[PDB]
Design a binder for this molecule. Structure first.
Ligand SMILES: *[C@@H]1O[C@H](CO)[C@@H](O[C@@H]2O[C@H](CO)[C@@H](O)[C@H](O)[C@H]2NC(C)=O)[C@H](O)[C@H]1NC(C)=O
Ligand SMILES: *[C@@H]1O[C@H](CO)[C@@H](O[C@@H]2O[C@H](CO)[C@@H](O)[C@H](O)[C@H]2NC(C)=O)[C@H](O)[C@H]1NC(C)=O
Ligand SMILES: *[C@@H]1O[C@H](CO)[C@@H](O[C@@H]2O[C@H](CO)[C@@H](O)[C@H](O)[C@H]2NC(C)=O)[C@H](O)[C@H]1NC(C)=O
Ligand SMILES: *[C@@H]1O[C@H](CO)[C@@H](O[C@@H]2O[C@H](CO)[C@@H](O)[C@H](O)[C@H]2NC(C)=O)[C@H](O)[C@H]1NC(C)=O
Ligand SMILES: *[C@@H]1O[C@H](CO)[C@@H](O[C@@H]2O[C@H](CO)[C@@H](O)[C@H](O)[C@H]2NC(C)=O)[C@H](O)[C@H]1NC(C)=O
Ligand SMILES: *[C@@H]1O[C@H](CO)[C@@H](O[C@@H]2O[C@H](CO)[C@@H](O)[C@H](O)[C@H]2NC(C)=O)[C@H](O)[C@H]1NC(C)=O
Ligand SMILES: *[C@@H]1O[C@H](CO)[C@@H](O[C@@H]2O[C@H](CO)[C@@H](O)[C@H](O)[C@H]2NC(C)=O)[C@H](O)[C@H]1NC(C)=O
Ligand SMILES: *[C@@H]1O[C@H](CO)[C@@H](O)[C@H](O)[C@H]1NC(C)=O
Ligand SMILES: *[C@@H]1O[C@H](CO)[C@@H](O)[C@H](O)[C@H]1NC(C)=O
Ligand SMILES: *[C@@H]1O[C@H](CO)[C@@H](O)[C@H](O)[C@H]1NC(C)=O
Ligand SMILES: *[C@@H]1O[C@H](CO)[C@@H](O)[C@H](O)[C@H]1NC(C)=O
Lengths: 113, 407, 94, 98, 49
């Protein structure tokens, strides 16, 4: 067996003819580029993310939606303004673009007895 | 003409309803799909105008709609309610559906079972709300409906003991509170039994949700597999045609591949639009069901399950919701003899809220849905006219409380 | 035709009519109880009394206007045949 | 600001409402319609991928939901109830719909 | 092929409408026939019996 392919007949595994060693095949990262604008009426400081691209091969933040550059992740939590994905979304709060996880709402412990 | 059937017992039954709410978000790239790193194909593709802004626009609209579906169905509660550490719900046991913070993603037993039970120019965009956030929406909904009843949908949550809430619900169906309070233990026991039986049936089905996933997957596989079709050209590959023929002569042979791939992409987008319309209809139904069966009772029959609706619980699924409708099903009926009215002292009497029944010798007034004989007095009866116009009148006595005690 | 075929419906018109008859009989005899469990019989006049009570009218009105109400219902049912002896919403589909 | 009108009589009215529930289950064979059973046309057509399979699957799905529509509209009873032979219905006469 | 594809697309679009109508009819059969509906103008004009 020289090479292996999975479903969609994608050749994904081969054996080198010299060492007789089996290897893997993985297409290098491809994806889209999306801008996160707070509107030209307000500012011009934009941010960019690269969908499902590890950004070791592209200040910088890594999400499940990709890697987002140009905004600083805050470990606070607010209400969603510009959706991004994976529960993380960005807003324009003081002066710069920030990225945070969504807040679903306030917590209540109803006085049940 | 004079026979009625009145139930003497009842059964609490919990039944599940599964309903798709969303579908996977996808996007395509014309340049990478039709051409795939080939400048000549890109040069020829611009001859067709803007046939590749429209496809991206359609797919983007589908994706945004997909996020809005979940947002409408689930995020119907403004706050996140928590169950108390101590759980004394009058004997009712919600440990199967209540979220537990001892496992992964704060899910419940039934949600865990329910989740276990189910390249080249293509991307699958992640959903906006992760499974954990949908889980805490569902947990908030259950906590609110357990602690407050239906008050948290109309405004501020107002706590109420669970047994009193179930008495409210029984009163809504048309059964008095004493029916709940006199046999609370039986009702709690059979509710627990039913909620364990649904667990067993699910452990051993969920086809409506799987169908959507399968159908999307097969559509995408067809789209990918359509790339290797010749479409009446020399060969499928764009290198085997450019690197073997004169470009002025291979220009005509490229157009077949471009047209075929454009047709395939257009067909895919049209099917996705129709399927998204259907999934949106289903999501709107799910949102209505949430607002009407979870945030309150429903008088609409067969809308929140078979039987007389009491209350419902939502559960998050891989791409949908699961409603556990608990209903009141009357059973063990026995048949009596009725009469529209009672003529006493030449005067017609009608039941205030029940019906007149007789076990053969005596007459009673019982509520319509549960057998509770009562003595026909003037307190549970009103008078209109005289006993000469109503057909089917019978004769007996009506008790006035004042006379026996006065003397 | 040229490779065109029309399949037969799974349910014959006979069995659809039989479902409709079963629903009619259940409504006439047992009231609305048969949709929520077992069918429980009740005389039709008392079921109409329930249904008058459902729209905010005291049940005595039915029991003292039974004859008039029955006559009105029979006349209104009779007028349907005349109004039929229309279905454009069904004809447009075919 | 102090006038009310109370009805003193009533009328029983019957109206008709008509709704479609299903279509005809029509199927088309892509190969026979496109080519009309000539071998070379079939050979040239099968260079086009799986358009015919897609069309056939879509039509089959339409037919299946056509059956499901009728099944969900009409099968809302478990037993098959029967009217008693005696027609004592308080004076109401259902003889035209039974 | 284009003619056949057009026919199938219009068939899908028409089937969607027929399914909406059938869902409404099933709702009416549940709510007006198996019970009495308080919703106005859903089961005719006037108070529903
Ligand atoms: C109503 O039904 C319940 C159960 O459906 C009956 O309770 C059962 O009673 C028998 C004998 O007393 C026991 O052996 C069962 O274990 C009971 N079942 C449950 C779930 O507790 C109850 O007796 C019935 N009531 C009437 C009036 O018949
Ligand atoms: C509520 O129900 C749950 C499960 O039905 C109970 O938890 C289990 O109870 C069984 C029977 O006693 C034990 O064998 C298990 O060890 C329990 N834990 C599990 C399955 O994780 C729970 O005890 C019930 N609530 C109350 C107050 O008894
Ligand atoms: C409803 O009550 C009536 C009252 O007798 C029952 O009628 C008879 O019931 C016996 C019991 O099995 C049958 O053998 C007869 O054939 C019935 N009809 C007669 C005597 O005319 C009837 O069975 C009861 N139904 C239910 C479900 O309890
Ligand atoms: C119908 O129910 C009534 C309920 O009051 C029965 O009348 C009493 O039945 C008990 C049962 O043994 C007797 O001890 C009483 O003497 C009866 N009268 C009164 C005033 O309480 C009646 O017997 C029942 N009839 C049938 C045929 O079961
Ligand atoms: C209900 O009671 C009235 C009053 O007693 C009954 O009317 C009597 O009927 C008897 C029998 O024919 C006559 O002898 C009396 O003259 C009637 N008196 C009056 C004031 O009408 C009536 O028949 C009873 N109904 C039933 C069904 O028993
Ligand atoms: C209420 O309306 C009904 C008809 O809708 C009236 O009944 C009619 O009365 C007149 C005169 O009394 C008769 O000539 C008709 O034959 C009756 N029609 C029917 C169908 O019986 C009734 O009079 C009206 N008023 C009251 C108080 O009921
Ligand atoms: C219910 O209505 C039908 C028709 O409106 C009645 O059928 C008629 O009955 C009379 C005898 O009363 C015959 O002379 C007619 O020829 C019948 N017409 C038909 C069958 O079309 C039927 O009698 C009514 N039901 C009752 C119980 O009277
Ligand atoms: C648009 O700009 C005006 C002027 O700076 C500002 O008042 C307004 O709030 C802006 N609108 C936004 C930020 O939506
Ligand atoms: C991304 O790349 C880094 C370095 O190659 C690696 O450690 C990491 O596991 C990769 N994936 C994610 C999700 O960070
Ligand atoms: C936010 O707080 C958490 C607390 O555990 C910490 O781990 C994280 O590094 C903090 N991040 C920032 C940006 O302050
Ligand atoms: C119902 O039928 C029986 C059968 O004889 C009859 O005696 C009775 O009077 C009828 N009911 C009415 C209200 O007329």
């Amino acid at each position: 067996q020289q090479f292996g392919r999975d479903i969609a007949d994608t050749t994904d595994a081969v054996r080198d003819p010299q060492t007789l060693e089996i290897l893997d095949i993985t297409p290098c990262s491809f994806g889209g580029v999306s801008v996160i604008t707070p509107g030209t009426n307000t500012s011009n400081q934009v941010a960019v993310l690269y969908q499902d691209v590890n950004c070791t091969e592209v200040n910088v933040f890594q999400t499940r939606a990709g890697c987002l550059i140009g905004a600083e992740h805050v470990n606070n939590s607010y209400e969603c303004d510009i959706p991004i994905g994976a529960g993380i979304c960005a807003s324009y709060q003081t002066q710069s673009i920030i990225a945070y996880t969504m807040s679903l709402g306030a917590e209540n412990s109803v006085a049940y007895s | 003409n004079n026979s009625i059937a009145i139930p003497t017992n009842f059964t609490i039954s919990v039944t599940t309803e599964i309903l798709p709410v969303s579908m996977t978000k996808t996007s395509v790239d014309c340049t990478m799909y039709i051409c795939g790193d080939s400048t000549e194909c890109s040069n020829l593709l611009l001859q067709y105008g803007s046939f590749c802004t429209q496809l991206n626009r359609a797919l983007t609209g589908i994706a945004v709609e997909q996020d809005k579906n979940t947002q409408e169905v689930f995020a119907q509660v403004k706050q996140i309610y928590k169950t108390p550490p101590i759980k004394d719900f009058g004997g009712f046991n919600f440990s199967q559906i209540l979220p537990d913070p001892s496992k992964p993603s704060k899910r419940s037993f039934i949600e865990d079972l329910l989740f276990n039970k189910v390249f080249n120019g293509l991307t699958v965009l992640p959903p906006l709300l992760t499974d954990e956030m949908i889980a805490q929406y569902t947990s908030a909904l259950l906590a609110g409906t357990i602690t407050s009843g239906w008050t948290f949908g109309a405004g501020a949550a107002l706590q109420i003991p669970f047994a009193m809430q179930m008495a409210y619900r029984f009163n809504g169906i048309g059964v008095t509170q004493n029916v709940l309070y006199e046999n609370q233990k039986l009702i709690a026991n059979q509710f627990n039994s039913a909620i364990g039986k649904i667990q067993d049936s699910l452990s051993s089905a969920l086809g409506k949700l799987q169908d959507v996933v399968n159908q999307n997957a097969q559509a995408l596989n067809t789209l990918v597999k359509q790339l290797s079709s010749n479409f009446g050209a020399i060969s499928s590959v764009l290198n085997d045609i450019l690197s073997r023929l004169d470009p002025p002569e291979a220009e005509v042979q490229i157009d077949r591949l471009i047209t075929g791939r454009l047709q395939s992409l257009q067909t895919y987008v049209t099917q996705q639009l129709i399927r998204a319309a259907e999934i949106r209809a289903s999501a709107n139904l799910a949102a209505t069901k949430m607002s009407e069966c979870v945030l309150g009772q429903s008088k609409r029959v067969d809308f929140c399950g078979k039987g007389y609706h009491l209350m419902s619980f939502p559960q998050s699924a891989p791409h949908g919701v699961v409603f556990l409708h608990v209903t009141y099903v009357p059973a063990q009926e026995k048949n009596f003899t009725t009469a529209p009215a009672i003529c006493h002292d030449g005067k017609a009497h009608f039941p205030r809220e029940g019906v007149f029944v007789s076990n053969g010798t005596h007459w009673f007034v019982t509520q319509r849905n549960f057998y509770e004989p009562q003595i026909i007095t003037t307190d549970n009866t009103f008078v209109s006219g005289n006993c000469d116009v109503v057909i089917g009148i019978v004769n007996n006595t009506v008790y006035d409380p004042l006379q026996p005690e006065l003397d």
